[model samples]
Target: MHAVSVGKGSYATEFPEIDFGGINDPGFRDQQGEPPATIYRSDRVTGPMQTNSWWGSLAVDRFSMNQYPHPFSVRHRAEGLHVFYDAPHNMVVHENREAGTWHIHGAIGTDFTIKHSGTANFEQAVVDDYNDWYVRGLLENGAHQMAITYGVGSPYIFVEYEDGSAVLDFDIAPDVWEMNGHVIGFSTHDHKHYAAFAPPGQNWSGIGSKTLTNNADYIAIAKLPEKDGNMLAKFEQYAYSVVRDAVADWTYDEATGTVTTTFEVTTEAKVQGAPDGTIFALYPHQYRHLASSSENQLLQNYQYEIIRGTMIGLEGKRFTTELTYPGVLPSLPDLGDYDRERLIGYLHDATSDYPTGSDTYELGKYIGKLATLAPIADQMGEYELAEQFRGELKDILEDWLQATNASGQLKGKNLFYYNENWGTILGYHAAHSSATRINDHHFHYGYFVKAAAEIARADQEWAKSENWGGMIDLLIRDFMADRDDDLFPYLRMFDPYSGNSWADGLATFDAGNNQQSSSEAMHAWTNVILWAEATGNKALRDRAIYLYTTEMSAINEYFFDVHQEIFPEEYGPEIVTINWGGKMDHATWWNSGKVEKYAINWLPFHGGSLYLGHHPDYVDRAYEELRRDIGSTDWNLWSNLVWMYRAFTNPDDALQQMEASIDDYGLFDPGNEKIIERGSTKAQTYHWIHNLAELGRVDPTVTANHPIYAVFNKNGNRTYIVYNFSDSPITVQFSDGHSIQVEPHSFNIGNG
Candidate 1:
């Protein structure tokens, strides 16, 4: 039976974090078992004695010889070798009947004899699972850690603490490497394992990011793939710690403990590369908050400002580490004015507003993107184009409204609900079981609803009409589904306590949930907030407030990894992970069980619905983290990073990086020759410029925000100022081999 009594303090009260980075084998706590030893006896090969016997020794005669002056006589008898000791002291006592030739010091005399021992009982502070778990709850203060050591030679050590936690498997004789008495690496003997250290200096050997390595250096010991002839290059400071399948050659300096690593990029590097080096690359960023480095300070967590490499002509490798922004540079051959104009003009001049075969929900995102474009087009005096854009939006709304009517083509059970442990797996779709249509169908409707709201804002009177009002209410019932109607619990999709909403649905209550599209979730609520504003629905507006705020906190907690000191992924420091069931503390680099993809779903959310993502700081942090390495996964994903950088992060850096890509890798459109830009260069620029012109001059506020930015801009004539507002600092050849350098940092088209 397990008993419980307060011994020391409570471990539950002190939930301490475990330090597993590297260890000195600081022993174990609450250890058990006595140190064991073996006894042996020597024997002769003659028939009388057995040879090399530890247990079965030959019988011997009992001693009974009278020494010179000492009177002691023992009658001969059958005797054997045995072992005995332990009388509350150190040192062992041995006795033998048949003895071999013995060696003694000078002289011997006897006087005393007949000694005995007795047993006694006393209370002692004994440590056991019972004492540690119950009696002695914990130490009064400090780590209150307990550990135990056992056996000889290499003993196993275990350490435990109050937080219902402990590290149980390590050896006392573990091998570790040190430099000048400081621990540099541990558990790294025979080059079989990895090691790490809080190095005192930085690495400048061009094997990693130019920024000085953070206080610590993590080593990735790897054996390369079969293709690379199994070349093992400890790829130093390898962007991340989790090795995928990369191989390289490295030079390790035994004299100085410095490793210079080089690796080759092969197609096999499908997702992440393998890291093998005496020292893998480990850099500091906002999300992965290790100690501050003495390196580039302007770098907030996500910024990847170059401290090396440049583009040059025919035969050269130009590189620079200049900190200050330069005014000019030599021109190079690229998309030039022709491609730039081709890209911009396509989006600006196209008659067809959107792609073909688009669904209502797809059309919602289309119009949402076009919402900014329409105003910009109108401001740019593209009135005919603007008219075309509005007509398409109107057409989509007309079709959606007609179908959602009771007798329309899209008519069915409008809202859906399922009773998981969460109580409300709220969703919406075209047509479910409990109150009608049920389970895993409601999230995307928010996008459609948001699109509908944007359309209503553009065409005000028509939206306030009774028909549109009823359709919006139908949409609202799914979002803020009411239990009174037995449709769904009020605002049931969200976890009110944790603040996050689960996207995955379940038929059984025991199945868990996951959030893949936090971006969609954020946009859904932003739409609700917007819809409430347009219709003056205060009740829904308050609901929007409650949901958005809670989600903001939850996303920060479960989504962003603030303590990047111990990054877990192989190549890049991915701050967001698959926040499985709201209890994962370890950062995840990839999510699919196949290990085929990195956890990149967070990028869309970072770029898409980040305004509601709480800290604006996440913008720069995520950008740098992505740019550090993940950009190479695909040019399009990199282009998405460019878009995100422009919209939320630094646009200057975004354009600068894009220029580098154009020079180095060409424009990168999806599935096209010449991987140049993200299909529409002008549209991307326009989005960037729109966000810049619309967002606040300072942090926190944006120009598009109602009252905050609108009260001032909307009260005026609302002049068409640079519509499609494509502000950029492009250095390209148009007519004079020069590009526009508009600094939206202090720039605006201004009010008419």
Candidate 2:
């Protein structure tokens, strides 16, 4: 257990230290960023240089002069890596591509001509926590001479001299001035940058140009300083308070449905008498949810306008944020009176065939369809149909759950194999390089786990450890394990600090690691919650809730820009199709169509997708944006998903569109086939739209005692519904002074 200061005060909180066991396996293919640090795996520094942070991304592949750090729009002008704040875009720009941007070098002569050898070699990487990471770059002139360390989200870059004097070399001479007698301010192209010298005074000889220093332990450069209010005075006070490391701890309260995450940084005064804390920049998401105490201490005058949003400065070493955990449900309640024969016909068409392929992605989708239909069948009193769905789901799950023995002989073609070196589980017949590249584990395995939970809901006996539950446990452990379970890394894809998961394992892209499908990621967490509730694991259930809530916040903020704060006004898109560490794009990996761009985040819509309706205005804006981008059409290509999302805000219009489709095409496209998303069914779409039209928009204001519950409002008339998976009946209380008695293994609705 590690005891950390709670709020930079007298009180402290103890949390179990998380050990992220190193990645040693030379992956199936030529992969960079493999852990267990060696010297320079690639010709450049490609190993995890804080792929998702504002500052750390600037250092990725920095061996070449062209790859300059663009910290919060402030571009490093390459005339010798001089910091040039581009006020036009509120960022920095690099113009001189042909010259070296290496700004630090050994001072061997007085002529100001000797430049540091441009051989910047990557030495090592240290992951301080899930959110923060460090990468060291070594510069050698015959022997190791100097080292530079870059920390994620840190505004200051630290430099240490090993053997001799150093010079602050800049290719483009800046208008230099002194601040607080010890800090130097440089202005070029109408932008400002600052540098603080340790030990107060050092070799005070060369002040005009190419300042040389002799006596100093290390030097700190303020990469992106606050542009207002005596900035130098603030820099001098905390100049020596350099961040050495950082870690994060979190807790989830089930009663209030809240999650509190605390981020603490360890700092050291490079020079004595320096202040105790350093200035840290808070992302828009973090600053918006600051704990009351932390919010009081925010540096109100400081702002760094970056790509994602405006990052404000905080004057403390530790801060906490509280977020509300939007709840999840196994399925929407059966509240609307629908055509019974039509619903049964759609279910029959859905279960008539197996998956089209053997890969995990396709198989998981198939399993998800059966799981979704089984509960609906039971709700409609079709016991035999529900049994048929459950039986097929269990059979497929059992086939995939088959394991390989010590001899390496496989029990089934579709099975999971453990890669001892990579410390990850690989599914056979893997799609999207899930096995070889170790990509999309959460996406591929979420469906299997959710389907298993659905089967367990009906028969706890079949879900016992001795039965097929043990293998299901392994699947969860592989992706969402909290601790270093020796077999797999902890929270493999989820970055606790960033509040989202990166889809790619190696993160080879220049934009840093990217996640294209936010909805699929949410689906993965929702699966965990359902699986936990069905199997009676309270700890796992709380953890999944935390993940679900935090990721939802990020999806709304980063992907949808639902608050209209993260994306710049000039960025002209209603949604970012792919979110990257350094930037966000309005395009996806496969297609550039506006339909795919908007619907990618809303695909595979389910009960948990009600979160999209939490902000009805944003839903209205996004749906209209999609309509305008695609223009008028016959409503083909994911029409079901597009309309279902629309129903969240404008159910009347959505229902009219669905009716038009049915009237024109007779409920099926052409050859007696459904014209819907591959992962969805005509029946599920019909059920979702009709019920939404009757109940109106989802009411996020009301909360229920049970997780598997939802409240809807139609012109002040409220409908509360709950699905009970337990063996005994229970009374569920809503926050709005209404209650309903839900029977075991049934869906119930009540009105107030």
Candidate 3:
């Protein structure tokens, strides 16, 4: 069992439990587990509920306005649901909001909305069963009920009624193009948006116009086909088979290092005697990795050019995509030879400095520094120095692990509080809204886990479950817990269908939820792999491999446009800085310069960052794009990060830059105006570049028996390197029949 008990003065073994009695809406209870704090959060304390999808976002609230209806709007006491539609060309990217034209509102009227003129009470939205991406919202107008279901990448909005009557009422009447029994084809006022409505085996009884008391003209379907059934509607440039529901399931094959996700949708014929299957839109990342059999099902002509690439529609209900996992390492292999004196100086400087406060983000960065530094120190035969760093790291980790000190008083900071209401563990002295908004938990907690792995590598006894490791396990379970976990939501920040994680807790932006630093998300997963390996947990390791590989594919497609299929020609950028559900932008939340736009995803570069080099051509294009954007590589912000990223494509150029920028103190200059990223160090950057210059690009084609090993290819010559943390010597074997015997606590390199 997990550790549970308050500790003394400033170090408690167990986390304190907290409840925000009224801060969280009471109606939001009954969630099977804690809902992801980011996407499902309500705008107000007393929530009416809000969620977003690839096509649009919906908010079940009391919003009443006769003009400019939102994508999902409701009246104070009216029963109708307004669904808006706007094409990609019409989207507006303002200073902070990326929004669509909200002129055309498809006001859906039902028997409940028409008969009950009283307020429409909404129930808390819940995630659909067997799926993590889709959400179901329910509303009742005095016992008359309506249900709405939507999900990411889904084009259709499904509606179900408890009673038989359904009406299509619009403030701006649609121009009816054709009426074929149960299906109606129409265009919006400006004729820019075209849509089709498919009722469950029913014909339109009447279609006409009406004027409200506010002089609002509306096109109303006074009486819809009378059946207590469901309907599907979409604003499509071209019509396809209508889909009813979509869900996804995934599995990982450890033997083959493959991750397969099968997306299955329930479909219905758009018209009588028509085909039963609906079109399944495949994102760029999805289409590029379609399994062999699934490729044969694509419909070349049916596609939508949205913000994220051309979404190709498939002709079948189910399709699977496969990705080969790129393995992760604890750290890059230790250099065979280096400037021992210079490295020692850098190490001393990094270890000497400590964070002034206990903010988790800052403290985690400090821990990451020691974690990376201790291993390198040992590699250089500075055993005493390594122990100093390791001991310091252990003390810092234990302090945070304990909820109180020996005096039995509660600790002010460096402790976790379990928010029972949200089923989330929040660290004290939270930074960047990590607690209140539940933002960036992965980013902050990942550093601690990485540090724990390092501690475990040297002292297995200290990492035992009853010892400090239990606290580390809690941190892992908080973000990467299994789906069946009783306390924490499954992979809280990750969206399995989207193949990437969303950073915002509330996802309050008009463009939908977004992620800024894809590399950081990778960092979180990479460390999980490390921790799993250190703890001998094969299950956790495999799960992280799936997440790592899938997310790597997404990062390449969406962030770098590696395949050149996702970004539009008009978008004018080879890479997108932020990826949103409905939009992509070259901007950051902090409005950073163009340099940051590319480097944000490349920071905290380490062993896992080797994936960035997997596609060498794309890396070349991305680096050139950065140089052109900033005019030169001599920029003052994150130059260290930029140089490190450059090493992947052109190591010679990166080495020259590093040498030219070394300061009198023997440290590479980070920048003129800004220091290196919080989580990176000059010591590691220097070691990383020098090693790459000699070892060449990472050869992912090869694998080793040990997780803490790296294979490099320089001019068809292979170099295998491994680090042994155990006291006894061990033989490290590579997949290519290469083997090297590494001594205890030594980093060894072998030529093959």
Candidate 4:
């Protein structure tokens, strides 16, 4: 994040000529007369770069310890102010210059919790693209250490990088001291930009090499520091890097005209922590072509990750950073024929053919799935399937338009229908259970509205000619903004004061809305926008945007947590819990207070906010949990995370995850639709996979609960998804399938 200045409202002057410093100069070093007040840009900045309402541009007051580091060093800057870390005193410094003199905010050092900062061989404070800063030093283990203490001015708690080297067992030696001799800067001469860490030191002299080349996707610049008349470089080429660990040792070979330096590698397993050897060749933008190929499973999984379309260039010798705009194209997955088929097919098959459920609650989810599936099926040319789903589409709309609730009331002038409250509620009913059909009125109606929009898209003629458009209009008024007759306050379900939608209207679970529907509510608006755009209803579009945008911000604010804490005990540091939206009532009753609603996991899919650009909280929260577990035994447990990575966050990680989940049958059952194992804890209620009438066994026959497996025979490709949704690996045998030891938490895609 580039730290630029913020205007102090009408109380401020014009935007000042704020300049960022490179290697030598200190940015905003002095202040003078009635310096305009300062505040960090809070709303303008998201992620961790958020501090106290400094609004992002904290002011400069007095001048004491605000001198530049003599020359060529790194300092974290955001919203026109600079943050510095003093290695000698082990304190974080926030400094800014407005009038003339540099104002210091060093008295507030409790912002940093790292009390340990020993002497170092090369210690310097560096800022990342995230605007987060790290203080790098030598380890007591003789290896290396770095502490990411601050982001935007707030101290980040979960950061502690002390992964030493393997040589001499990567000892915890004294702190890695700062290299006081040479300053650093980037030279963009002759169309070639090189970030140089100069006056190369040997023994400690680094290896000079170029390992990457420029590419259409992204280009990598050489961060070659001068060493032994040659420049020192890293092993990876043309990629952005967060300084996971500082360099441990260096060497310059005069005979070969080469310098080799090594940085330690830290892992979750903590196996290999030492700095490794280096090479002299350059490999240009290494990910060859992932969008078109999937054959290199073993090769691709180990490949260095790429943040698509993000341009990664070398900053200082230590940083593998990116330029302002990474690349020309949007680097998300191609959404090719195969991928779309798989994603839509899973979602479609899961909810299709629901046997016409009893009430609108069950019917809502049932039809919600079908509504979303219609467009996907039509787009995929699966007309037989499309006709089947669309047939059910009209069925629900007609049923709801004619049906009435138990009280025998049509209620209002606006024709809004009713549904049994489907979701979990804490209060009791005639059934003596909390899981009664009592609440979720708006949630159920959201699906009907969504279905109407999808049908309108497919049948524009039917929309206007069949007067279906008028019915959808009536449906909108039933629970929309400008409501008369007090049916439902389209705005009331959402908390403008709090920023999220409330699910339960009755006294119940912590007085907060169900997070599982957070995305569903947004999906309703997505459909609203679609319907509005279809009919050229500018006013409706504007109203939907007004309601949805605020709720979008609110959802991100309350439903998602920013702090890092995955396990139950570490919940103290977390800002939002798994189930709790604004309050910690209960983790959705079933797992009550235990954070079982890991249902928030599927928000990206059901809520579909990634398409709207609002998953920073969702992405970070999922990553903390998924990064360690990698894969889980349950489909819902892990598949949604893969969707987040694939569709929202990191496509590269998604590819890696897909490789882990595929079974041996060339079939990819993302929702565990293939078979229900006999010893399974829960029956596979997944909408997509079903039980086949005929069963087949190969050798040492495997026992399945429902049947052998569900087989879907498409045009030329007969897709068979296997089920390995179990804690341990088991061998499953099909007609021609045998000796197939399904990996734990894994599925496969096999093409005959």
The clash count of every prediction, one per candidate, is 50, 7, 19, 77
Q: Best candidate, TM-score-wise?
A: 2
Error of 2 at 43 (Å): 20
Rank by lDDT, descending?
2, 3, 4, 1
State the C-alpha lDDT per candidate: 0.30, 0.63, 0.61, 0.31
Candidate 4, residues 1-752, lDDT tens digits: the string is 11111111000112222222222322112210111233122232222121111111111111111211101111222111122222223322121222111111121121111212222342323222122122221112234433322211111111233442111001112111222223222222111112322121211111121111111111112222222122323312112232333221223222221223222222121112322221111111111111122222212112111101111111122211010100000011111224444555553444424523233444555566566555445544566676777777876665445322234433121123222121111111111111121234345556666676656655555455235565565456534544222333224344332234555332222111243456656766655655664555656654554445445544443444332221123232222332222123213333221112443334323313333223444554555554433344334343433333333334344444444553322322334422211111011111111111011111111222211122233222343444343346666544433335555433433211
Q: Runs in model 4 with CA error above 4 Å?
A: 1-334, 337-357, 404-438, 464-466, 483-490, 508-516, 563-582, 591-596, 604-608, 611-621, 626-647, 659-752
**Better by lDDT, candidate 3 or 1:** 3
In model 3, what lDDT does residue 394 have? 83
lDDT of 2 at 370: 82
lDDT of 4 at 689: 16
lDDT (10s digit) by residue, model 3, range 1-752: 22345222122224433322333544322211233433323332221121222211233123222211112222213445544444443554433323211111122231112211223344433222224555444445434555454445554445555543455555565555565555555545554333334443455544444211111111112111111122212222113334455555677765445689888876544334544454556777888889998878876654655556566656666889998775666677665345878877777777546664456877877787788887777766688988998898888887877765466655655677665555667776666667655677888888888888888878888877777777787788777777677667777778777788878655544555678889888988988887776777778877787788888989988888887766655455567778876567777777466667777788677667788888888888888877875676675566668778888868889877767764424332333324355566777878888778888887879866566676789899997777666678989777788888988765675211
The clash number for model 4 is 77
Off by over 4 Å in 3: 1-3, 6-80, 92-130, 190-201, 205-247, 265-278, 315-317, 570-573, 664-675, 701-709, 722-752
Residue 222 of model 2 has an lDDT of 69
Which scores greater on TM-score, model 2 or model 3?
2
**TM-scores, each model vs. reference:** 0.41, 0.82, 0.80, 0.38
lDDT of 1 by residue, 39-83 (tens): 111121111111100011111111111111001100111110011
Quote model 4's TM-score: 0.38
| Residue ranges of candidate 1 with Cα displaced over 4 Å | 1-346, 349-363, 404-442, 482-486, 507-511, 563-572, 582-618, 631-638, 659-685, 689-698, 701-752
- Give candidate 2 misplaced runs (Cα > 4 Å): 1-87, 90-152, 160-168, 179-182, 190-192, 203-215, 224-229, 273-276, 405-408, 411-413, 662-674, 750-752
